Coordinates of C-alpha atoms in Angstrom, one line a residue:
Chain A
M1 CA 12.5 -42.9 5.9
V2 CA 12.1 -40.7 2.4
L3 CA 10.0 -38.1 1.4
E4 CA 7.3 -38.2 4.5
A5 CA 5.4 -35.1 6.0
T6 CA 3.8 -35.7 9.7
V7 CA 1.7 -33.8 11.6
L8 CA 2.7 -33.3 14.9
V9 CA -0.5 -33.4 17.3
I10 CA 0.4 -32.5 20.6
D11 CA -1.6 -32.0 23.3
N12 CA -1.4 -29.2 26.2
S13 CA -3.5 -30.0 29.4
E14 CA -3.9 -30.2 33.2
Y15 CA -1.9 -33.4 33.0
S16 CA 1.1 -31.6 31.1
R17 CA 2.1 -29.4 34.2
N18 CA 2.8 -32.3 36.1
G19 CA 6.7 -33.1 35.8
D20 CA 7.4 -36.2 35.2
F21 CA 9.9 -35.3 32.7
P22 CA 11.9 -32.2 33.1
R23 CA 11.2 -29.8 34.3
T24 CA 7.1 -30.2 33.6
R25 CA 6.1 -32.0 30.8
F26 CA 5.7 -28.7 28.3
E27 CA 9.2 -28.7 28.7
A28 CA 10.1 -32.0 27.7
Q29 CA 7.7 -31.4 24.7
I30 CA 9.5 -28.8 23.2
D31 CA 12.8 -30.9 23.4
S32 CA 10.9 -33.8 21.7
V33 CA 10.4 -31.9 18.6
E34 CA 14.0 -30.9 18.0
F35 CA 15.1 -34.7 17.3
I36 CA 12.3 -35.5 15.1
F37 CA 12.2 -32.7 13.3
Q38 CA 16.2 -33.3 12.9
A39 CA 16.0 -37.1 12.5
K40 CA 13.6 -36.6 9.0
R41 CA 16.3 -34.8 7.0
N42 CA 19.0 -36.8 7.8
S43 CA 16.9 -39.4 6.1
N44 CA 15.7 -37.2 3.1
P45 CA 16.2 -33.1 3.6
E46 CA 12.8 -32.7 1.7
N47 CA 10.8 -33.7 4.4
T48 CA 8.5 -31.5 6.5
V49 CA 7.4 -31.6 9.7
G50 CA 3.9 -29.9 10.4
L51 CA 2.5 -28.8 13.8
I52 CA -1.5 -28.7 15.0
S53 CA -2.8 -28.9 18.8
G54 CA -5.4 -30.7 19.7
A55 CA -5.4 -28.2 23.2
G56 CA -8.4 -25.7 23.9
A57 CA -11.3 -25.0 23.2
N58 CA -11.4 -25.5 19.4
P59 CA -8.3 -27.5 18.3
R60 CA -6.4 -25.0 15.9
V61 CA -3.6 -24.7 13.3
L62 CA -0.5 -23.4 15.3
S63 CA 2.3 -24.0 12.5
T64 CA 2.0 -25.1 8.8
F65 CA 4.8 -27.4 6.7
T66 CA 8.0 -25.7 6.4
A67 CA 11.8 -27.0 6.6
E68 CA 12.5 -24.4 9.3
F69 CA 12.3 -26.7 13.0
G70 CA 12.6 -22.3 14.5
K71 CA 9.4 -21.9 12.8
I72 CA 7.4 -24.8 14.4
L73 CA 8.4 -24.6 17.4
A74 CA 8.4 -20.7 17.3
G75 CA 4.2 -20.9 17.2
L76 CA 4.3 -24.2 20.3
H77 CA 5.1 -21.3 22.6
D78 CA 2.3 -19.6 22.9
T79 CA -0.1 -22.9 23.5
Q80 CA -3.4 -23.2 25.3
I81 CA -3.1 -25.6 28.6
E82 CA -6.7 -25.8 29.8
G83 CA -8.0 -27.8 27.4
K84 CA -8.1 -31.7 27.3
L85 CA -7.6 -34.0 23.7
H86 CA -10.1 -34.3 21.5
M87 CA -9.0 -37.7 19.5
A88 CA -11.5 -37.0 16.6
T89 CA -11.3 -34.0 16.2
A90 CA -7.4 -33.7 15.3
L91 CA -7.5 -36.3 12.7
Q92 CA -10.2 -34.8 10.7
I93 CA -7.5 -31.0 10.6
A94 CA -5.1 -33.4 10.4
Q95 CA -6.0 -34.7 7.4
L96 CA -6.8 -31.3 6.1
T97 CA -3.3 -30.1 6.7
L98 CA -1.6 -33.1 5.0
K99 CA -3.8 -31.4 1.8
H100 CA -2.2 -28.4 1.2
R101 CA 1.6 -29.4 0.5
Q102 CA 4.6 -28.2 -2.2
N103 CA 4.6 -31.6 -3.2
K104 CA 2.3 -34.8 -2.4
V105 CA 4.8 -37.6 -3.5
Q106 CA 5.3 -37.3 0.5
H107 CA 3.5 -39.8 2.3
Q108 CA 0.9 -39.0 4.6
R109 CA 1.5 -40.3 9.2
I110 CA -0.3 -38.6 12.2
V111 CA 1.9 -39.3 15.4
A112 CA -0.3 -38.3 18.2
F113 CA 1.5 -37.4 22.1
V114 CA -1.6 -38.6 24.7
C115 CA -1.2 -36.6 27.5
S116 CA -4.6 -36.7 28.4
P117 CA -7.5 -39.0 27.6
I118 CA -10.2 -38.4 25.1
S119 CA -13.0 -36.0 25.5
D120 CA -14.9 -37.4 22.7
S121 CA -16.5 -40.7 22.4
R122 CA -15.8 -44.7 21.2
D123 CA -18.8 -43.4 18.3
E124 CA -16.8 -40.9 17.0
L125 CA -13.1 -43.1 16.6
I126 CA -14.9 -46.1 15.0
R127 CA -16.0 -44.0 12.1
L128 CA -12.2 -42.5 12.0
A129 CA -11.0 -45.5 11.4
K130 CA -12.6 -46.7 8.1
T131 CA -12.1 -42.7 7.2
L132 CA -8.2 -42.9 8.0
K133 CA -7.4 -46.1 5.5
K134 CA -9.2 -44.7 2.1
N135 CA -6.6 -41.8 2.4
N136 CA -3.3 -44.3 3.8
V137 CA -2.8 -42.1 6.8
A138 CA -1.3 -44.2 9.5
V139 CA -2.6 -43.7 13.3
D140 CA 0.7 -44.1 15.6
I141 CA -0.4 -43.0 18.8
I142 CA 2.7 -42.5 21.5
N143 CA 0.7 -43.0 24.7
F144 CA 2.1 -41.7 27.7
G145 CA -1.3 -39.9 29.5
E146 CA -3.5 -42.8 29.7
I147 CA -1.9 -45.6 31.1
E148 CA -0.3 -43.0 34.3
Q149 CA -4.5 -43.9 35.5
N150 CA -5.7 -44.8 32.9
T151 CA -6.8 -47.3 29.9
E152 CA -6.7 -47.1 26.5
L153 CA -9.1 -48.5 23.7
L154 CA -6.8 -47.3 20.9
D155 CA -5.0 -50.2 20.6
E156 CA -8.2 -51.6 18.3
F157 CA -8.0 -48.6 15.8
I158 CA -4.3 -48.7 15.1
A159 CA -5.0 -52.5 13.9
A160 CA -7.7 -51.6 11.9
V161 CA -5.8 -48.9 10.0
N162 CA -2.8 -51.2 9.3
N163 CA -2.7 -52.5 5.7
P164 CA 0.1 -52.1 2.9
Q165 CA -0.1 -48.6 3.1
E166 CA 2.9 -45.4 2.8
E167 CA 3.4 -45.8 6.6
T168 CA 2.5 -48.9 8.9
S169 CA 1.0 -48.0 12.0
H170 CA 2.0 -49.3 15.4
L171 CA 1.8 -48.6 18.9
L172 CA 4.9 -47.0 20.8
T173 CA 4.1 -47.4 24.5
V174 CA 6.4 -44.7 27.0
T175 CA 6.4 -45.2 29.9
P176 CA 4.5 -42.2 32.3
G177 CA 7.0 -41.5 34.9
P178 CA 10.6 -40.4 34.8
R179 CA 12.7 -41.9 31.3
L180 CA 13.2 -38.8 29.8
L181 CA 10.5 -38.8 27.2
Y182 CA 12.5 -37.1 24.2
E183 CA 15.3 -39.9 24.0
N184 CA 12.3 -42.5 24.2
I185 CA 10.5 -41.0 21.1
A186 CA 13.4 -40.8 19.3
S187 CA 14.9 -44.0 20.0
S188 CA 11.5 -46.0 19.3
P189 CA 10.5 -46.4 15.6
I190 CA 9.2 -43.5 13.9
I191 CA 11.1 -43.7 10.4
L192 CA 12.3 -47.1 11.2
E193 CA 9.0 -48.3 10.4
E194 CA 8.2 -47.9 6.8
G195 CA 5.7 -49.0 4.4
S196 CA 5.2 -51.7 1.8
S197 CA 2.9 -52.4 -1.4
Chain B
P55 CA 19.3 18.5 -25.8
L56 CA 20.9 18.1 -22.4
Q57 CA 19.5 21.0 -20.0
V58 CA 22.4 23.5 -19.1
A59 CA 24.2 23.0 -15.8
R60 CA 27.7 24.1 -14.0
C61 CA 28.7 22.6 -11.0
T62 CA 28.6 25.0 -7.8
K63 CA 30.7 22.6 -5.5
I64 CA 31.9 18.6 -5.7
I65 CA 30.9 16.3 -2.8
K66 CA 31.5 13.0 -2.8
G67 CA 29.1 9.7 -1.9
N68 CA 32.5 7.7 -1.9
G69 CA 33.6 9.4 1.4
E70 CA 30.6 11.0 3.1
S71 CA 28.0 8.6 1.8
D72 CA 24.6 8.7 0.4
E73 CA 23.0 6.2 1.6
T74 CA 22.0 3.7 4.6
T75 CA 23.9 0.1 4.9
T76 CA 25.7 0.1 7.9
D77 CA 26.8 3.6 7.8
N78 CA 25.6 7.3 7.8
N79 CA 29.3 9.2 6.7
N80 CA 32.1 7.9 5.1
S81 CA 32.5 5.0 2.9
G82 CA 36.1 2.9 3.1
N83 CA 35.8 0.7 -0.2
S84 CA 35.2 4.3 -1.8
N85 CA 34.3 3.2 -5.5
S86 CA 30.8 2.1 -3.8
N87 CA 28.1 4.7 -1.8
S88 CA 27.6 3.4 1.3
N89 CA 30.1 0.4 2.1
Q90 CA 32.9 -0.3 4.2
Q91 CA 33.7 -3.8 2.9
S92 CA 32.6 -6.3 0.9
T93 CA 31.1 -8.5 3.3
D94 CA 28.2 -6.3 3.1
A95 CA 26.9 -8.0 0.5
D96 CA 26.0 -5.2 -1.6
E97 CA 28.7 -3.1 -3.9
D98 CA 27.5 0.3 -5.4
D99 CA 29.0 2.3 -8.5
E100 CA 30.0 6.0 -7.2
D101 CA 32.5 8.1 -8.3
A102 CA 31.3 11.0 -7.0
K103 CA 27.9 12.6 -6.5
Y104 CA 28.3 16.7 -8.1
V105 CA 25.9 19.6 -7.1
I106 CA 25.2 21.6 -10.2
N107 CA 22.9 24.1 -10.4
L108 CA 20.9 24.6 -13.4
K109 CA 19.8 27.5 -15.9
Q110 CA 16.3 27.0 -14.3
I111 CA 18.4 27.8 -10.9
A112 CA 16.5 24.5 -8.7
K113 CA 19.7 22.6 -7.8
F114 CA 20.4 18.6 -7.9
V115 CA 22.4 15.9 -7.4
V116 CA 23.3 14.5 -10.6
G117 CA 24.2 10.6 -11.5
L118 CA 26.9 9.8 -13.4
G119 CA 27.4 9.8 -17.3
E120 CA 28.9 6.8 -19.7
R121 CA 32.4 8.5 -20.8
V122 CA 32.6 11.2 -17.6
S123 CA 36.1 11.5 -15.3
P124 CA 35.8 12.7 -11.9
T125 CA 39.3 14.3 -13.1
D126 CA 37.5 16.7 -15.8
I127 CA 34.3 17.9 -13.8
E128 CA 34.6 20.3 -10.8
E129 CA 34.0 23.2 -9.2
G130 CA 33.6 26.0 -12.2
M131 CA 33.1 23.6 -14.9
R132 CA 29.7 23.9 -16.8
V133 CA 28.4 20.0 -17.7
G134 CA 25.0 19.5 -19.7
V135 CA 22.7 17.2 -17.7
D136 CA 19.4 16.0 -18.5
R137 CA 16.5 18.3 -18.6
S138 CA 13.7 16.0 -16.7
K139 CA 15.8 13.2 -15.2
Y140 CA 18.7 15.0 -13.9
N141 CA 22.0 12.9 -15.0
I142 CA 25.0 14.2 -16.5
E143 CA 26.2 12.4 -19.9
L144 CA 28.6 14.9 -22.1
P145 CA 30.4 17.9 -20.4
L146 CA 30.3 21.0 -21.7
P147 CA 33.2 24.0 -22.9
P148 CA 34.3 26.2 -19.9
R149 CA 32.9 29.9 -19.7
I150 CA 30.2 31.3 -20.8
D151 CA 31.4 35.3 -21.5
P152 CA 32.2 34.6 -25.2
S153 CA 28.6 35.9 -26.4
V154 CA 29.3 39.4 -24.9
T155 CA 33.6 39.7 -25.3
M156 CA 33.5 38.9 -29.1
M157 CA 31.3 42.1 -30.0
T158 CA 33.3 44.3 -27.5
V159 CA 36.8 43.6 -28.7
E160 CA 37.8 44.7 -32.2
Chain C
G1 CA 33.4 -18.9 37.0
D2 CA 34.4 -20.7 39.7
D3 CA 32.8 -24.4 39.8
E4 CA 33.4 -27.1 42.5
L5 CA 34.5 -25.1 45.1
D6 CA 36.1 -26.2 47.9
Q7 CA 32.8 -25.9 50.1
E8 CA 30.6 -27.9 47.6
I9 CA 33.4 -31.2 47.8
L10 CA 32.6 -31.3 52.0
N11 CA 29.4 -30.7 51.6
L12 CA 28.6 -33.3 49.0
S13 CA 30.8 -36.5 47.8
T14 CA 31.8 -37.0 44.8
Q15 CA 29.1 -39.8 44.5
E16 CA 26.2 -37.3 45.1
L17 CA 27.9 -34.7 42.4
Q18 CA 27.8 -37.2 39.8
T19 CA 23.9 -37.8 41.1
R20 CA 24.4 -33.6 40.5
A21 CA 25.8 -34.0 36.6
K22 CA 23.0 -35.9 35.4
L23 CA 20.1 -33.4 36.7
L24 CA 22.3 -30.4 35.4
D25 CA 22.4 -32.0 31.8
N26 CA 18.3 -32.1 32.3
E27 CA 18.0 -28.4 32.5
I28 CA 20.7 -27.5 30.3
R29 CA 18.7 -29.4 26.9
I30 CA 15.6 -27.2 28.1
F31 CA 17.5 -24.0 27.6
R32 CA 19.4 -25.5 24.5
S33 CA 15.8 -25.3 22.4
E34 CA 15.6 -21.9 23.3
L35 CA 18.0 -21.5 21.6
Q36 CA 16.5 -22.6 18.3
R37 CA 13.4 -20.4 19.3
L38 CA 15.4 -17.1 19.9
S39 CA 17.6 -18.1 16.2
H40 CA 15.1 -17.9 14.2
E41 CA 13.3 -14.8 15.3
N42 CA 16.5 -13.6 14.8
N43 CA 17.0 -14.7 11.1
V44 CA 13.4 -14.2 9.8
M45 CA 14.0 -10.2 11.1
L46 CA 17.0 -9.9 9.1
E47 CA 15.8 -11.4 5.7
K48 CA 13.3 -8.5 6.7
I49 CA 15.2 -5.4 7.4
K50 CA 17.3 -6.0 3.6
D51 CA 13.5 -6.8 1.8
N52 CA 12.9 -2.8 3.1
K53 CA 16.7 -1.6 2.3
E54 CA 16.2 -2.7 -1.3
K55 CA 12.9 -0.9 -2.0
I56 CA 14.4 2.2 -0.5
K57 CA 17.6 2.0 -2.3
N58 CA 15.5 2.8 -6.1
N59 CA 14.2 6.3 -4.3
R60 CA 16.9 6.9 -2.1
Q61 CA 20.3 7.3 -5.1
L62 CA 21.1 10.0 -6.9
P63 CA 19.3 12.3 -9.0
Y64 CA 16.8 14.0 -6.3
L65 CA 16.1 17.9 -5.2
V66 CA 18.6 20.2 -3.7
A67 CA 16.4 22.0 -0.6
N68 CA 16.9 24.3 2.8
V69 CA 15.3 24.0 5.6
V70 CA 13.8 27.1 7.0
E71 CA 13.2 26.1 10.5
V72 CA 12.3 22.7 11.9
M73 CA 9.0 22.7 13.3
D74 CA 9.0 20.2 15.3
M75 CA 5.2 19.4 15.6
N76 CA 3.2 17.5 17.9
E77 CA 3.4 13.7 18.7
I78 CA 0.3 12.1 20.1
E79 CA -2.5 14.2 22.2
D80 CA -5.0 11.4 20.5
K81 CA -5.9 7.7 21.3
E82 CA -5.3 7.7 17.2
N83 CA -2.8 9.0 14.8
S84 CA 0.0 11.3 15.8
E85 CA -1.8 14.3 14.3
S86 CA -3.6 16.7 15.8
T87 CA -6.6 16.2 13.2
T88 CA -8.5 12.6 13.6
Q89 CA -8.2 10.5 10.7
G90 CA -8.5 6.8 9.8
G91 CA -5.5 5.5 10.6
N92 CA -3.5 4.8 13.8
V93 CA -0.5 5.8 15.8
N94 CA 3.2 5.8 14.4
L95 CA 5.7 7.9 12.8
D96 CA 4.2 7.4 9.2
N97 CA 1.2 5.3 8.3
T98 CA -1.2 7.8 7.7
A99 CA -0.4 9.5 11.3
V100 CA 2.7 12.2 11.2
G101 CA 4.8 12.8 13.5
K102 CA 7.3 15.4 13.8
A103 CA 7.5 17.9 10.2
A104 CA 9.9 20.4 9.0
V105 CA 9.4 23.6 6.5
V106 CA 11.9 23.6 3.6
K107 CA 12.3 26.1 1.4
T108 CA 13.0 23.9 -1.8
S109 CA 14.9 24.7 -5.4
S110 CA 12.2 24.0 -7.1
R111 CA 10.4 27.7 -5.4
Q112 CA 8.0 26.3 -3.3
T113 CA 7.9 26.1 0.7
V114 CA 6.7 22.6 1.3
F115 CA 6.1 21.0 5.3
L116 CA 5.7 17.5 4.3
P117 CA 5.0 14.8 6.6
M118 CA 8.9 13.1 8.0
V119 CA 10.5 9.9 6.9
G120 CA 11.5 7.4 8.7
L121 CA 15.5 7.6 8.1
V122 CA 16.0 11.3 8.7
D123 CA 14.6 12.5 11.8
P124 CA 14.4 15.9 13.3
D125 CA 17.6 15.0 15.6
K126 CA 19.7 14.9 12.4
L127 CA 18.9 18.7 11.1
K128 CA 19.5 22.1 12.5
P129 CA 17.9 25.4 10.9
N130 CA 20.0 26.8 7.5
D131 CA 20.8 23.2 6.7
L132 CA 21.2 21.6 3.1
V133 CA 18.8 18.5 2.6
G134 CA 18.2 16.6 -0.4
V135 CA 14.7 16.3 -1.0
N136 CA 13.5 13.2 -3.2
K137 CA 12.7 15.1 -7.2
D138 CA 9.2 13.8 -7.5
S139 CA 7.1 13.6 -4.1
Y140 CA 8.8 16.3 -1.8
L141 CA 10.1 14.4 1.6
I142 CA 13.2 14.8 3.2
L143 CA 15.3 12.0 1.7
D144 CA 18.9 12.5 2.7
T145 CA 20.8 14.9 4.7
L146 CA 23.4 17.0 2.9
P147 CA 26.7 19.1 4.8
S148 CA 26.4 23.1 4.5
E149 CA 26.6 24.8 1.3
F150 CA 30.4 25.7 0.2
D151 CA 31.0 28.3 -2.4
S152 CA 34.3 29.1 -4.4
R153 CA 33.7 33.1 -4.3
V154 CA 33.6 32.3 -0.3
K155 CA 36.3 30.0 0.3
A156 CA 38.9 32.6 -1.5
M157 CA 37.3 35.7 0.5
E158 CA 39.1 34.2 3.7
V159 CA 42.5 34.5 3.7
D160 CA 44.2 37.5 1.9
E161 CA 46.2 39.1 4.6
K162 CA 48.9 39.2 2.6
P163 CA 49.7 41.8 1.0
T164 CA 50.5 43.1 4.0
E165 CA 50.8 46.8 4.7
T166 CA 51.7 46.9 8.4
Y167 CA 52.3 50.6 10.5
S168 CA 55.7 51.3 9.3
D169 CA 54.6 52.0 5.1
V170 CA 51.6 53.9 6.6
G171 CA 52.8 57.6 7.1
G172 CA 51.2 58.8 10.5
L173 CA 47.8 59.0 10.5
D174 CA 47.7 58.8 14.5
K175 CA 45.8 59.9 16.2
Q176 CA 43.7 56.7 14.5
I177 CA 46.3 54.2 14.7
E178 CA 46.1 54.4 18.2
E179 CA 42.5 54.2 18.2
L180 CA 42.3 50.8 16.1
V181 CA 44.9 49.2 18.4
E182 CA 42.9 50.2 20.9
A183 CA 39.2 48.4 19.5
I184 CA 40.6 45.4 18.1
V185 CA 44.3 44.2 19.0
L186 CA 44.3 45.0 22.3
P187 CA 41.7 42.9 23.6
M188 CA 42.1 40.1 21.1
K189 CA 45.0 39.3 22.3
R190 CA 44.6 39.9 26.3
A191 CA 41.0 38.1 26.0
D192 CA 41.0 35.9 28.8
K193 CA 41.1 39.1 31.3
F194 CA 38.2 40.6 29.2
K195 CA 35.7 37.8 30.2
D196 CA 37.5 37.7 34.1
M197 CA 36.7 41.8 34.5
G198 CA 33.1 41.8 32.9
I199 CA 33.5 44.7 30.3
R200 CA 32.3 44.8 27.0
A201 CA 34.5 44.3 24.1
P202 CA 33.8 46.9 21.3
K203 CA 30.7 45.5 19.4
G204 CA 32.6 46.6 16.0
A205 CA 33.7 49.3 14.4
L206 CA 33.0 51.6 11.6
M207 CA 36.0 53.7 10.2
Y208 CA 34.3 56.2 7.8
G209 CA 35.4 60.0 6.1
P210 CA 36.5 60.8 2.7
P211 CA 38.5 57.9 0.4
Chain D
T1 CA 4.4 -13.5 -43.5
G2 CA 4.5 -16.0 -39.9
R3 CA 2.4 -12.8 -37.9
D4 CA -0.8 -11.2 -39.1
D5 CA 1.0 -7.9 -36.8
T6 CA -2.4 -6.7 -35.0
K7 CA -3.2 -5.3 -31.3
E8 CA -6.4 -6.6 -29.0
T9 CA -9.4 -4.7 -28.0
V10 CA -8.6 -4.4 -24.7
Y11 CA -11.2 -5.9 -21.7
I12 CA -10.8 -4.5 -18.7
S13 CA -13.3 -5.5 -16.3
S14 CA -14.7 -3.7 -13.3
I15 CA -11.9 -5.4 -10.7
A16 CA -9.1 -4.2 -12.6
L17 CA -10.4 -0.1 -13.3
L18 CA -10.7 0.6 -9.8
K19 CA -7.5 -1.0 -8.8
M20 CA -5.3 0.6 -11.5
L21 CA -6.8 4.5 -10.3
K22 CA -6.7 4.2 -6.7
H23 CA -3.3 3.4 -6.6
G24 CA -2.2 5.7 -10.1
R25 CA -3.4 9.2 -8.0
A26 CA -2.6 7.9 -3.9
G27 CA 0.9 7.6 -5.7
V28 CA 0.7 10.8 -7.7
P29 CA 3.2 12.4 -8.4
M30 CA 5.4 9.5 -8.6
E31 CA 5.6 7.2 -12.0
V32 CA 4.0 3.6 -10.4
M33 CA 4.2 0.5 -11.6
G34 CA 2.8 -3.0 -10.9
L35 CA 1.8 -6.4 -13.6
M36 CA -1.6 -7.1 -15.2
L37 CA -2.9 -10.6 -14.7
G38 CA -5.4 -11.6 -17.4
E39 CA -6.5 -14.6 -20.1
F40 CA -5.6 -14.5 -23.6
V41 CA -7.9 -15.9 -26.2
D42 CA -8.5 -14.9 -29.6
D43 CA -5.9 -12.1 -31.6
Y44 CA -8.2 -9.4 -31.1
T45 CA -9.5 -10.1 -27.2
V46 CA -6.8 -9.8 -24.1
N47 CA -8.7 -9.8 -20.4
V48 CA -7.6 -7.6 -17.5
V49 CA -8.9 -10.0 -14.6
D50 CA -7.5 -8.6 -11.9
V51 CA -4.0 -6.4 -11.7
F52 CA -1.7 -6.0 -8.8
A53 CA 0.3 -2.8 -7.7
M54 CA 4.4 -3.5 -7.4
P55 CA 6.3 -0.8 -5.3
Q56 CA 7.2 3.0 -5.5
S57 CA 10.8 4.3 -7.0
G58 CA 11.0 7.6 -7.5
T59 CA 13.6 7.2 -10.6
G60 CA 10.7 6.5 -12.5
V61 CA 9.7 3.5 -14.5
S62 CA 12.9 1.6 -15.3
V63 CA 13.9 -2.4 -15.7
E64 CA 16.7 -1.3 -13.5
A65 CA 13.8 0.1 -10.9
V66 CA 11.3 -3.3 -10.8
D67 CA 11.7 -5.7 -7.4
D68 CA 11.6 -9.1 -9.0
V69 CA 12.2 -10.8 -5.7
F70 CA 8.5 -9.7 -4.9
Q71 CA 6.6 -10.6 -8.1
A72 CA 7.7 -14.1 -7.4
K73 CA 6.6 -13.8 -3.9
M74 CA 3.0 -12.6 -5.0
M75 CA 3.1 -15.7 -7.7
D76 CA 4.0 -18.1 -4.9
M77 CA 1.1 -16.9 -3.0
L78 CA -1.2 -16.9 -6.2
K79 CA -0.5 -20.4 -6.2
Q80 CA -1.2 -21.3 -3.2
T81 CA -5.2 -19.8 -3.4
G82 CA -5.3 -21.6 -6.8
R83 CA -5.7 -18.2 -8.6
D84 CA -2.8 -18.6 -11.0
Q85 CA -3.2 -17.0 -14.4
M86 CA -0.7 -15.8 -17.2
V87 CA 0.8 -12.3 -17.3
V88 CA -1.7 -10.6 -19.9
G89 CA 0.8 -6.9 -20.4
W90 CA 1.8 -3.8 -17.1
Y91 CA 0.5 -1.2 -16.3
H92 CA 1.9 2.2 -15.0
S93 CA 0.6 5.8 -14.2
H94 CA 2.5 9.0 -15.9
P95 CA 2.5 11.8 -13.1
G96 CA 0.7 14.1 -14.4
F97 CA 1.3 14.2 -18.4

């Protein structure tokens, strides 16, 4: 709820030009941002939502932390689409993005949209888990594209991270077919979950 | 010392404007240099611009004074302005012929 | 304008037009996000305009120099792939950057004739030969416009026909009073005829002789 | 007394001299201004480590011709790179005298 910085990892891929959410997934993921961004403000108006991309040849920063929803969407309009997820890589840049902030009181959380399965490895992801819980960063995986025709081994990393943290780590299933992507993440816990000591 | 000037003509910044805000001619508010409304989010201080010709015979639009009235400084009136900064501060007496005319009369 | 015409009601029944209503919402939410995209790009841009206009303000206000425009030169704009001037310099194509487009020749009151890179807010359009112009005092650029010069004696000179001497209080003087009418008064009044016929109007007159 | 009323011998770096000079001359004839960033130590030493120029004015340098919104914006950057230092005076160029 209160004082929280959240780095959105939004994937743009060859599984997201599919139209299970109207009129493709690119268009439904634009609508996910608006609801997320408003909700944070409603709890605490000093909340910032950041954005990076697991998409293309090299994951990159699309937008930095800002108090405006406008700037974040402005950056998202020009994204790659040819790439796939690189999950390990996404986490290391997002950790870096959460370092540079106006204040440091803000909670560290990463929420990652999965539209595409890993292009990396299990060997990498094991390492990432030990790395994250030292710094109290949560892994919270919205999957909806690694369950369409696939299986995920990401359940293991969620539990390995979760301890008393700033933000708890939990797995959020959203059907792959039509169910309206944007309202399902908004309805499901993304601030209803909070930390403990 | 003020460097000596006389107003050739007066043309006014409060109704032909002088800056760019939303208009390039005519101010409505007319106590401003460029504003036709107060919801611009700007206001200026303008009384009239006054075009003066110096005894250097270079010409300037010159700022306001510190007690000058728009009803004293008009065409044909001597005024003093700064010698490097070009702003009226104190006006000067009328005429400029008493130098030759006191000696001719007897 | 007109929604749910006669034609749509026959075609598709009410139940169907419910499924129609739901599909419409989903697409209205998509478009609705673009409005937030567009609003923002507009919001930042306003802020930029006012941040400029504040820097201008200081230079722009009175005091500044008075000058006259001798002629608007209308120097070339673009003939190269870099800058806007004939000569090749480090910059790039713009009105002002290191590039110089149009320019104009002014004769200052500081007794100099200045050819100057032209500003963004004064264009060559806004000028004509022999126009009085404010030029910034410290660096010589056309800074703002001014109307044409007016002088107290010039203003006076127009209208002084009264006292009137007529031709009833000037004793005789003919041929010459008749001649004066032919040159002046007669084409002045029947002016429309003189265009139609194609003859010239006398190109002034000279009246001369002992005082 | 409460003071020693003494002026420092001013140490101007390499980094500051060229910036001051380049902006004065391109900008001349026209008086121009900008702040000086440095470090103060002693009472006889004052360092002019870096400088940044502040925008043009044809009304010369005044306290009513400076852009404080610009000064603020620069100090905000200065903090994000981690180079923040205190203002140690100010520089200006006269235009020809």
